[PDB]
Design a protein around this ligand. Structure first.
Ligand SMILES: Nc1ncnc2c1ncn2[C@@H]1O[C@H](CSCC[C@H](N)C(=O)O)[C@@H](O)[C@H]1O
Ligand SMILES: [Mn+2]
Length: 870
């Protein structure tokens, strides 16, 4: 009977996992029972698929293959969004051979969109399957009717998937086609959007009991000028402008397509569907791109933060602006969070004129009860460098996801922004130093353009927080200057093939202010899990003394003086990433480990080559000397050596690991009469002559007698079998190695010794894991550039209790070392070695705790050394 156990339907602001997921899960299960497919298929919540986690999969019990992937979102605008449709599609691409059928689904429960991934036709809107979009209802509906309809829709979708009976929606496809062919013709592009938009707008508005002109577009086919006038009576001036459609248009006067668009409007009741569809096609000369991909969850949080920095109500004359509006998603989301805004207070601008219509459509239908011929958003298609302070006079809040170009700045773009800033301020840009990015110039230009007190919220690459180039230094100077930084928001973002990523940040300023303490807001939780009601109240209750933390987040305060004085070095000190990692290590690793210093092992800095004559000790390190000497040195006098920690690149430190050699003559080479002493005399002779050759005065004083003694001494600093070596300085590779035979090590590495073969290989296996590396990055929480750790800090590393690993596993752990290289710290990946080690610490859950360490490591490394991720 579909008996519902739920008392309420969600609110858009409810935590997705806590509130939406149980409803969706109960419905999927019921759908399997109703059709009797529960004998064959199971519902799995949070299914790990490669490096990502799916909200729901319908999974075959016997084969473990995927019938259907279901991704849940909170809002209708999210379901319409190409970004989130690509995220859902990604699960099918990541599952590949584990797939039964290529069907996937995106839903906020109110609306279900149903798709079939086809690798030979990857464009999302080409993949919508009939009868999407399925309108289940609205969250203000009676729960039981709504729940029943949810169950029936899932039943339909499951039946179609299991039989591979899906059919691609043709109208969507026909409209995509029409627009793709008009992309390079602004006249016909616009003409198509006039007709299509008229029909879609009328559907959205009629479904919401808003009065619309009663005649359908096709009625005006012979008099299209009338279509323009009929549209203007609703609003959307920039859409309902010239040029008129042509009567002779071979594509747009199609009853089927036009009805379909009107119906689509009736179904969605939002401007989002059509706007996203247009944006996909228009944004094909990409880019067009900005700092982050579409993030509606972020936009919702930004809205709350903006209002809190504003610190007062927005009056009726005050405007909310996005000067590089793009798709309109961010402006639409942020605007919607201001109760009582009028359509006339929203201003969207973008240089790309192909976005004009879609911006009109999205933002005009945003407030469907209010939009009219006298009350509509302003939509402009101007380069920011053409705008003037007067254009921003009424602007009280700016939000932006500024243009970003992942590569090398176009100098003509650079110049165009710089001149405009010079013109406005009389001075060069505060940000234009080093290898400038357009995003910083854009932000600075907008800042100069607005009035004091204007709230400016900008999404920026996180590198700006922590990087040490002159461009990041100048940027932080800008932030605590004119920009009037008040708030820093740190959050995790979602990627196509990566669950969480901390590579972006939000900077919120109030122009011309100089607040004493700057807010730092850190979300430990993905933004979909943030209860928006809790956050609203946490920010506005946080008085002077008592700082109230929102759930899954920490709010802290930093003194401006501290950021001002730490502008060259960076603001890494403000992030919590190092603290949580220290906590994670303590709650998960410490009980089963001991500190290296407590253990039986000895620690010692590499001894070789500390007291000069490096070029002789490492006979083959210098090419010109070696071109001379190579024919003169017996191969068995050469021992594998470490000078620069860089030259090894493998866990096994032997002759095959490195070409670098140390010169160790045998004992008989030092006594007189033998042939060995002869061989050595020859060598030293040629060495002396080359030192002359290199000398400007053709002089070298030091005798063979002395060189003999140095070589004899340094020979005694060899490293015993099964030493494990720790580089003192690393950039990007997780480096640790072991030797099997006698080697020589420079001062550039730390030596660990004392154990036996097995104890030593196990320690190497540990050092090669994400867990040991995590600990290193934690000790280095206050560093930039290379990670430099000496005996002092490494003494304190936690190493696993020897008597805690089972003998089979010990054998698996050592073995695994034999089949790895050095993992990339900027992009760690969970692998057998880590999972193996995970068995020592956890029964629940190996994968998920190993996946956490990996993510924490990645985030810490991104702070210390960004460039490895670009
Ligand atoms: N020089 C310039 N002046 C004004 N706007 C610009 C610009 N260069 C790029 N832009 C715009 O900056 C935008 C990046 S932001 C991407 C917008 C995103 N869809 C959203 O909802 O926020 C692009 O749309 C691009 O057209
Ligand atoms: Mn979800």
């Amino acid at each position: 009977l579909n008996n519902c156990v739920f008392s309420y339907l969600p609110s858009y602001g409810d935590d997705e996992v806590s509130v939406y997921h149980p409803i969706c899960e109960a419905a999927l299960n019921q759908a399997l029972v109703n059709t009797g497919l529960d004998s064959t298929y199971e519902v799995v919540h949070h299914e790990l698929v490669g490096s990502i986690e799916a909200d729901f999969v319908i999974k075959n019990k016997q084969t473990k293959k995927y019938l259907l992937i279901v991704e849940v979102k909170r809002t209708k605008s999210q379901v319409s969004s190409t970004r989130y449709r690509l995220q859902a599609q990604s699960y099918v691409r990541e599952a590949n051979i584990k797939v039964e059928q290529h069907y996937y689904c995106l839903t906020n429960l109110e609306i279900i969109d149903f798709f079939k991934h086809d690798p030979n036709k990857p464009v999302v809107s080409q993949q919508i399957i009939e009868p999407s979009p399925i309108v289940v209802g609205n969250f203000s509906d009676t729960v039981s009717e709504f729940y029943n309809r949810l169950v029936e829709a899932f039943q339909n979708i499951i039946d179609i998937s299991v039989n591979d009976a899906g059919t691609y929606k043709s109208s969507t496809a026909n409209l995509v086609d029409i627009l793709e062919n008009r992309k390079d013709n602004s006249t016909s592009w616009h003409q198509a959007l006039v007709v299509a938009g008229y029909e879609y707008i009328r559907g959205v508005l009629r479904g919401q009991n808003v009065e619309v002109p009663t005649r359908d577009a096709i009625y005006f086919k012979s008099r299209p000028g009338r279509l323009l006038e009929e549209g203007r009576k609703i609003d959307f001036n920039v859409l309902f402008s010239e040029p008129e459609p042509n009567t002779n248009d071979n594509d747009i006067w199609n009853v089927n397509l036009l009805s379909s668009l009107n119906d689509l409007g009736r179904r969605i009741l939002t401007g989002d569907e059509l706007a996203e569809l247009i944006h996909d096609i228009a944004t094909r000369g990409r880019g067009h791109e900005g700092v982050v991909p579409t993030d509606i969850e972020l936009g919702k949080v930004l809205s709350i933060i903006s209002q809190h920095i504003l610190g007062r109500p927005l009056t009726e004359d005050e405007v909310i602006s996005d000067p590089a509006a793009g798709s309109g998603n961010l402006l639409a989301t942020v605007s919607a969070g201001f109760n009582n805004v009028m359509p006339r207070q929203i201003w969207a601008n973008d240089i790309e004129t192909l976005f004009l219509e879609l911006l009109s459509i999205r933002l005009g239908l945003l407030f469907p009860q209010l939009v009219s011929s006298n009350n509509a958003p302003t939509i402009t298609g101007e380069d920011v460098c053409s705008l003037n302070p007067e254009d921003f006079a009424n602007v009280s809040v700016v939000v932006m996801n500024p243009p970003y170009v992942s590569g090398v700045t176009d100098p003509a773009i650079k110049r165009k922004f710089a001149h405009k800033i010079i013109q406005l301020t009389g001075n060069r840009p505060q940000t234009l130093f080093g290898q400038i990015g357009v995003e910083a110039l854009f932000l600075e230009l907008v800042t100069e353009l607005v009035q004091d007190g204007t709230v400016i919220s900008a999404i920026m690459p996180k590198q700006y927080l922590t990087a040490q180039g002159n461009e990041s230094k100048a940027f932080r100077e800008f932030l605590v200057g004119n920009f009037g930084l008040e708030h820093i928001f740190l959050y995790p973002r979602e990627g196509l093939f990566e669950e969480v990523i901390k590579d972006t940040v939000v900077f919120v300023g109030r122009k011309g202010s100089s607040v004493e303490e700057i807010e730092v807001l850190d979300s430990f939780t993905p933004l979909e899990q943030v209860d928006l009601h809790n956050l609203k109240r946490a920010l506005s209750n946080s008085s002077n003394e008592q700082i109230i933390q929102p759930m899954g987040m920490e709010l802290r305060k930093e003194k401006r003086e501290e950021l001002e004085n730490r502008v060259t070095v960076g603001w890494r000190h403000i992030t919590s990433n190092g603290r949580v990692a220290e906590e994670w290590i303590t709650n998960n690793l410490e009980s089963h480990c001991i500190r290296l210093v407590a253990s039986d092992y000895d620690l010692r800095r590499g001894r070789v080559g500390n007291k000069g004559a490096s070029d002789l000790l490492f006979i083959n390190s210098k090419k010109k000397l070696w071109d001379l000497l190579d024919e003169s040195v017996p191969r068995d006098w050469l021992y594998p050596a470490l000078r620069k920690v860089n030259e090894i690149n493998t866990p096994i430190f032997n002759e095959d690991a490195t070409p670098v050699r140390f010169l160790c003559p045998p004992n008989s080479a030092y006594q007189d009469g033998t042939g060995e002493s002869i061989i050595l005399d020859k060598i030293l002779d040629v060495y002396v002559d080359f030192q002359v050759y290199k000398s400007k005065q053709k002089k070298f004083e030091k005798s063979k007698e002395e060189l003999k003694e140095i070589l004899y001494k340094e020979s005694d600093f060899y490293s015993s079998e099964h030493t494990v070596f720790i580089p003192r300085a690393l950039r990007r590779s997780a480096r640790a190695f072991i030797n099997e035979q006698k080697v020589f090590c420079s001062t550039n590495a730390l030596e660990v010794f004392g154990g036996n073969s097995e104890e030593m290989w196990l320690l190497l296996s540990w050092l090669s894991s994400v867990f040991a590396q995590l600990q290193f990055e934690a000790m280095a929480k206050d560093q930039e550039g290379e990670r430099k750790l000496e005996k002092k800090s490494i003494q304190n590393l936690y190493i696993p209790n020897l008597g805690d690993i089972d003998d089979v596993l010990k054998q698996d752990l050592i073995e695994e070392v034999r089949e790895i290289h050095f993992f990339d710290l900027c992009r760690p990946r969970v692998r057998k070695l880590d999972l193996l080690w995970a068995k020592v610490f956890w029964s629940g859950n190996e994968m998920s705790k190993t996946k956490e360490a990996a993510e924490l490591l990645e985030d810490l490394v991104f702070e210390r050394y960004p460039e490895g991720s670009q």
